[model samples]
Target: IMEVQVVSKKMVKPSVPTPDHHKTCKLTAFDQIAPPDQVPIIYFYNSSNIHNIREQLVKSLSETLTKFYPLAGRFVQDGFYVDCNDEGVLYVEAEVNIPLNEFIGQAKKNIQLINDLVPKKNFKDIHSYENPIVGLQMSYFKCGGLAICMYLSHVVADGYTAAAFTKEWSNTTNGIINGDQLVSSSPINFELATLVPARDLSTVIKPAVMPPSKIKETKVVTRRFLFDENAISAFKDHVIKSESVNRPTRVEVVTSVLWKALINQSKLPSSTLYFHLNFRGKTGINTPPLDNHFSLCGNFYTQVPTRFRGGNQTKQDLELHELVKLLRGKLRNTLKNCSEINTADGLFLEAASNFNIIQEDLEDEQVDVRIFTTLCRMPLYETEFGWGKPEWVTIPEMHLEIVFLLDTKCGTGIEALVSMDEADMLQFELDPTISAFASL
Candidate 1:
């Protein structure tokens, strides 16, 4: 196996106080819909050198905690209230427990044990839940009979930022500079209005609307799909051939194919697609400028909608370039109109509320149209904290009609974690489109 080494560290300072226009971007609606108690779970593997690694992890974690001392109150406090005290701080919790070997033969059993013990509701608290999210748990079945777990909040930083912190912490513990140097620059200036120029003040309403009661009405069941390296590569090739226009990159092509497959299986209407996009570019709010020097702070991050015409049929013979162009165009428009990106305004929020309810109505029949966010390209795997890289990482549960795309060490092809009805999944599995790429 190739050895894992620490990479460069990049500092991220918090920008100025969130402007008034962006204050409404609170955890109100999002909290209620996907409460803090419902934060996602990330699992990672640890090498056999459990003892030394655990000690280093603990020390690193302790140091990382100190960086966000202001948010410690919330970590020690209840998970219900929102922690607006320090916008620059995020919550993280660490634990050292048992070995990996003991649980190796019973992966499913181990998962069930953790789930039963941790209970989903406990992880999904309203208000503060979204901010101080959890972190990775490093475990090894050997050495002194123990494992380690850490909980981190998504609000304080994204996966990249967290990984950097972890790497630094490890270096500190090992007493060696592991090449984990963070950039001295502060976080980018977060100008909400500048990003969303329309200034639709009326759109900022309270009690932010939730996904319609109808869409929220259906029970969400999650199924895991693991693919080997060969399978991933083959799928990417399949997508390239399926769409002939300028060959779409793997992410674009696969996303298109999966989007169509999901739409078809869910039997969604032709006009709706509620997917999310990553706005980590150098423009607009949350688009961190290349020159920023801060190490940690909120950058503009918001979800946008993508409406597909002709639904799945449009995907059937669409050229890869055309699909890429369409997807890219939407992203471009979003950046161009960064200010209006916050659809939380009254009218849009109301429309979203109605749409949510309508989608819920369709759920009884198992036909709902909703696209989840994809963080596949995010450099999650690259996060190294001294001891080594994670063995496995994942977001276990998703409440909406969504799918999460991520990368595994397995290779270039992506992993699709779909949340759907078992029956729908079965049908999807049997679909010719999927089978065509299944062997790939």
Candidate 2:
């Protein structure tokens, strides 16, 4: 077993204090219901000749936090707003006993070790006053390779905002090292309250998704599957020939295949699929920071559901093309709803209704529910801190019935990190159709 030990820990505060006008960053309706947990992202880089990587990282992070003030603040009022008190972000440095290559090579089977690369925290209690809004861990391998794990509270950032913040940090680091003034191409926006005001949950009908106390816990194991460009391209061609439609996207093709495999494995009569959609530009709010499409950050996604009933139906009826068609058609309705969200009340009620449906469907033991979220196109590889872009990025194992999709290192294929129950995973791995294209 590879051992890791923390060498040092401290708080890295923003370089400058936030203006008084921005002291209390109000949360939007979307942020109100975001999962009360930290979203972890790990970036791995090869050994570089630079001797001052640590100093550069700390300095850049401090400066970047000044622009992203809310990240350096703590949540207030059960997540209604951020104190923006500049309490500083928790940062740690660790040493790994093994060479980075050895760790990366065994990545397929060592999720436990991968999970350990990030800072540990009781994610179930994210609302506590003591929890830092952001936590960062820098792990050094024996051979000089480095791993950077970033943990940001979901109440403050979603996938889009997370990547954007990382990108901005890298931009600042690169600019500082290159002896150039960092020009803010797109200013960070903290005006979500103007778009969607936060309503008192106590006064209104509480959605089933909120109030984390009601969430059920289940045991699950995560598995990684890699589908190379050749496999995905071939699958797309096959779908085009079979469906008589325009070419399917890489995400569409990969997701459909997995859904089919899961359906075939479970043999369930009723199943529902939820795809989390970013509601940035779809709502005609694509101007300036609000339209940076998702530059507005802080939980701006909606989980759209699509149902499938297979009563007495054969496996042949649930072909890849059929599933793909189902997703595309339902996706239009999601987009339509996004466009229709013209007021704060509109968005709040929309989400409440959706969450109510999710709550009931998820509670019904006879129905199978699965969620798929993607980080495919959001600058997953452009992060550079003078050593060059990361060779790989890893997201820790998520809850059961969740499938997280990411782009392969080469940007030519998709990688699905799926977490499922042990028994279901065993059958899923053995599915002949899944095995045909995916490599463990």
Candidate 3:
């Protein structure tokens, strides 16, 4: 199915191996209790000097692993704790006949070739497969372009941390070539394991597992939709003026509009919207400064939609602004609700407590669960690796019914990577409400 082959494979060890004593970090509840999905993201670059690009990438990545040491190790406690042994991470080199131009269109369809570009474990996509928590694939195209695929276990890092890792790695590669000061890892690296502390909730919460019936029963299709600067401005204006409400931020507007579109079209009786909230920005009492902490931070709170179907306000019963109000309310609550999250033994106790109920609901199809995460304001476009920044960066073939809101490379536009059931996607794609605000 894939017209691609890996020509080389090797373990990329950290420049300095983690000391044996410091090799283990227990996962916080935030890190352990997540849907068993590894974050898959690929960055595309157009470069004529393929050989030079390859060499620098390899060198810089080895150095990068030194900072994100846990990446060089694998999970030991069946996804509970990360044994930060310098076991070395997975690295692969591949060749593709098609030009980089072909990839853009192909990637939009969730093509197998796109999937193949990222090195993965041979098993199913649900569980964290490879012992190496991080895997890299550098595929060379005949057109003198290259695609860099990064597979990161969600157990350790989120998209923000991933973006930070990428930008810093780029800085490392590009900085050395320009004779700039080498960015040290001492500032960014923190002991999240001990600071946040892991909790044991074996009884109150069950660990997350993938059910074949839940995934097999639905056919999923991933699609990207862009809302340019002008469109977004107008959409905000419309939402504020029509709803007679306070002006919302770009991300809030995007969430409100998309939520309205999906729920209105799907006709699902009830659903829960989950938003991943970063712990770094608002509260620093216990969390690390995520901006400085690249790749080492993912300890965040999972805010379940409290405004689920109930009483006279079922999802179907609620209108557009009603949903906006609920989402906006959550935006504030995530930071205010907990000085420290409720963890039973050490990590993910609360998440396990909530995730179990959501999983059971999904099995019976009682309520649909949709996750929304935004990487809009991040410096994704500034990632330069000797060659200029990427043409288009995307998380392709993402999990079902999840939404990743990413910013455009050049302009102030929001590109949403949305996945849904094949049938729902077809209708969701053509929904008038979304098209009115965003360009598909």
Q: Estimate the overall C-alpha local distance difference test score of candidate 1.
A: 0.44
Top-TM-score structure, candidate number: 2
- Counting clashing residue pairs in each candidate, in order, gives 59, 0, 10
lDDT of 1 by residue, 31-56 (tens): 22221222354545555354455545
Candidate 3 positional error at 28, Å: 2.1
Predicted structure 2, TM vs. truth: 0.91
Please say which candidate is ahead in TM-score: 2 or 3. 2
Q: Which candidate is the best by lDDT?
A: 2
Model 1 / residue 280 / CA error / Å: 4.3
Q: Candidate 1 or 2, higher lDDT? A: 2
lDDT for model 3:
0.68
Score residue 116 of candidate 2 by CA lDDT.
70
* lDDT head-to-head 2 vs 3, winner: 2
On residues 91-178, what C-alpha lDDT tens digit does candidate 2 reach at each position? 9999989989898878756565687788875334445767888999999998789988998888888888888789888888777776
Q: Report the C-alpha displacement of residue 182, candidate 1, in angstroms.
A: 11
Residue-by-residue lDDT tens digits, candidate 3, 1-440: 23677889998888888877768766766665655566777888886474566777788888887877777876765647777878777889998877888777666555434777877653443343346777788898776687888888776777666776787688788876765665533435546655546555565553443454345678776777777788778778876776656877777777777887776765656666777665455443434433343334555555455345535565545555666677777656644554464422322444454566666555644466677777778877768876678887887676466898888888788888887788888788788767543333
Each prediction's whole-model lDDT (CA) = 0.44, 0.77, 0.68
RMSD of each: 8.7, 3.1, 4.0
